[PDB]
Amino acid sequence: SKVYDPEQRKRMITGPQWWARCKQMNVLDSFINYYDSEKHAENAVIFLHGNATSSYLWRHVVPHIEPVARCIIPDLIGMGKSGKSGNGSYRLLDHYKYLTAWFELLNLPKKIIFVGHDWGAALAFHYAYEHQDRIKAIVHMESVVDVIESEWPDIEEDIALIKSEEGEKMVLENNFFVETVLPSKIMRKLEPEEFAAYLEPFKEKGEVRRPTLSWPREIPLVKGGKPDVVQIVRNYNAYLRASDDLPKLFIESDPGFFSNAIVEGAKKFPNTEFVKVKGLHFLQEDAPDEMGKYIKSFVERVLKNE
Ligand SMILES: O=C(Cc1ccc(O)cc1)Nc1ncc(-c2ccc(O)cc2)nc1Cc1ccccc1
């Protein structure tokens, strides 16, 4: 039985409070909502959320890192308070189209530090693969580290379901990932206002919820997965396994949820330091300060050493 953190309300940041601190910038035919700490712009730490979430995920993590480097946290296209995609498509490369276009307008330094979770990590990894000169370090967690060739025995049957018209009902009609999966993968009970911040972009039924269905349908299952995403992930996985000069931090979840394959995948990338914090999947909600402190020390060490 999950309980409220009795000390959390004293520092709670509501959706409105977070969004008030964000900025918007026109990108291609749409716009990106994002948080930008601005100061210390000689470095840039870009935090990338994944499915069901938004920049809001990082709200308690980022304060620890701001004093050492400019921190920048977007809402991916179609998610959070960002604009929608011009053609209503939300595949990995649609997200990547807007993300990379957005980067071009941020006055970034030559080498960028990424912090990625879930599909946000996939975006960071793909960016790194295509810009191998532009990466100072990578922090990742609960990340799409590799393809799936084989904890989740019926994964194929589940992905087959999510790819059927039942997936449309599960998500567009019934908001499966936001309203059911998200709270199940946080160890504490979220304050009502915190859950409301996650629900808000997806509060209405129908097509607005598309990004939360499109993400799982991108799953790089070797057997049945979209072959283009499978190849993207094979490509960046090979590159990461050879990236000895790229400092990395893997933040492992304890106990995690079916996370053994992620950890083993992560251990195939050289120059990775491993740390562990409490959580299931959305570990930012269970150990944000331990995460922030780990990320801060890592960044500091990377900037020294360099
Ligand atoms: O729990 C299930 C089984 C299931 C539940 C509801 C339903 O309508 C159909 C099947 N599957 C599952 N099993 C594990 C996880 C999961 C794994 C890792 C993680 O970090 C978070 C969730 N998520 C899920 C949910 C899911 C994902 C993708 C496609 C269909 C259903």
Ligand 1 atom 7 nearest Cα: 158
Long-range contacts of 297-303 (CB under 8 A, 24+ apart): 298/137, 298/139, 298/247, 298/249, 298/273, 299/43, 299/45, 299/65, 299/68, 299/69, 299/113, 299/137, 300/68, 301/247, 302/113, 302/136, 302/137, 302/247, 303/43, 303/68, 303/69
Q: Which atom of ligand 1 is nearest to the CA of 159?
A: 29
Say whether 281 counts as a known binding-site residue.
yes
**Tokens encoding 80:** 């959070």
In angstroms, what is the resolution?
1.8
Ligand 1 atom 2 nearest Cα: 158
Q: Which atom of ligand 1 is nearest to the CA of 176?
A: 8
Residue 257 in contact with ligand 1 by CB distance below 6 A: yes
Number of residues assigned to the chain:
306
What kind of architecture, by CATH, is found in domain 1-306?
3-Layer(aba) Sandwich (3.40)
* Alpha carbons 62 and 57: distance in angstroms, whole number: 10
Residue 161 in contact with ligand 1 by CB distance below 6 A: yes
Omega before 255 within 30 of 0, i.e. cis = yes
The method recorded for this entry reads X-ray
If DSSP codes are grouped into helix, strand and coil, which group holds residue 134?
Answer: coil
If DSSP codes are grouped into helix, strand and coil, which group holds residue 131?
Answer: coil
Which residues on neighbouring strands pair with residue 117, listed in sequence order?
Answer: 141
Ligand 1 center to residue 273 CA distance, Å? 29
Cβ contact 207:175 at 8 Å: no
**Tokens encoding 15:** 């959706």
**Strands across the sheet containing 135-143:** 23-27, 30-36, 70-74, 44-48, 112-118, 135-143, 248-255, 272-279
* Alpha carbons 232 and 13: distance in angstroms, whole number: 36
Known active-site residue 142? yes
Type of residue found at 262? I
Over its C-alpha atoms, the chain yields an Rg (Å, rounded) of: 18
Residue 200 in contact with ligand 1 by CB distance below 6 A: no
